Design a protein around this nucleic acid. Sequence first.
DNA 1: GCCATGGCTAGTA
DNA 2: CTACTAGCCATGG
Length: 108
Amino acid sequence: MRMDEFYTKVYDAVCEIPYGKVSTYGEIARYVGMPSYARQVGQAMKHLHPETHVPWHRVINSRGTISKRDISAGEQRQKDRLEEEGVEIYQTSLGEYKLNLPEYMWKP
DNA sequence: GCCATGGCTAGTA
DNA sequence: CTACTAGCCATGG
């Protein structure tokens, strides 16, 4: 599987995530037949341009939290976009953004 | 080739 | 619950 093939599948997958729903790097990776490529699912998200209609904001980590990144703006934007989607997000002490994963999780 | 990065994760304290 | 580590793997200097 070429990297370009992967990136495209990941993107196709993410677009399938329903409004106001959420999925996981690892889940998407598995979903596209690449269980060990969870980190690369991150990369795919990061690579996207700001205009993209791909719901990159609907992908968090396995702990149901929003991942911290080099570009802190995204971390913030993801929280905001999700909240607009009507997604209850509380803030852990030692400010990490968290949510009830079992509820919002997307299951095809 | 080595090395550091980086939106990860399960297992292990 | 928080912290950390081992396994993980593309990317690019």
